[PDB]
Amino acid sequence: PVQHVGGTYTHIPLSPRTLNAWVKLVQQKKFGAEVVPGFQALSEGCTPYDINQMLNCVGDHQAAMQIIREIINEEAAEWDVQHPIPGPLPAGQLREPRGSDIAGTTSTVEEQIQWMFRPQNPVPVGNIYRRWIQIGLQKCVRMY
Amino acid sequence: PVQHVGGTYTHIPLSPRTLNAWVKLVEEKKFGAEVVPGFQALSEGCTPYDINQMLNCVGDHQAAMQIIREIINEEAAEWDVQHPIPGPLPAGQLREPRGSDIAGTTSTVEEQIQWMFRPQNPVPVGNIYRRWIQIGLQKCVRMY
Incomplete structure (x- = not known):
């Protein structure tokens, strides 16, 4: 998650108990419907980084992880079609997020937070990625 | 929770993150099955104190709270039947916990910690209470 202290936005990790509640769902509910809610x-x-921490326990269940990954790739690829880069990038300027940046594969949590909380035209990359994961989890539920 | 720093066990509350995660979990579907794990x-x-904070954080779900309360009262009464007293308790000495002590009604967090961590027959009052709350939550899930 993101904390807002000295007028600055910074990362704060999911608490161990929170992550452990997710881990316990995933291990206990074998990709039954309530994994979604x-x-x-x-x-x-x-942030995407946090979601990627949540997906670490899902990597213990490759059947599910494969399903989810395939959906992430699909959604990232469509994002990129829908957001063509006009380029080139001005010196020193943070790029617009690509699909892989939203997925947190190619971005730092600091970049993620900048997109989420920058003063002009923020991009809710955590919430966009959460939608992709939900699509994937719904598919896991219907395929397990 | 409880921390142990140089020979003393003391209370540390659940983080605001953790408590807010609990709230979200409860309200996603309104006591969907996911609340139990x-x-x-x-x-x-x-400790019981901490569990009571969790419960107060969802106290606007009065229907659920009443269902959980009835179960607490049942379990507390059966705990008291199963533990008739008898002492002797010296004037310098923490009583053995009763049902309302396990529930955090008639006990302080310091008393709870004393029972949980004393070396002479500790009583895991937090885990006992957690068991009761689970029964109540299972009932909430079915009755909502």
């Missing part, structure tokens, strides 16, 4: 709830306010 | 993880290592 559980993810929604527990991913509230998350 | 989630509560287990979120309340790990808690």
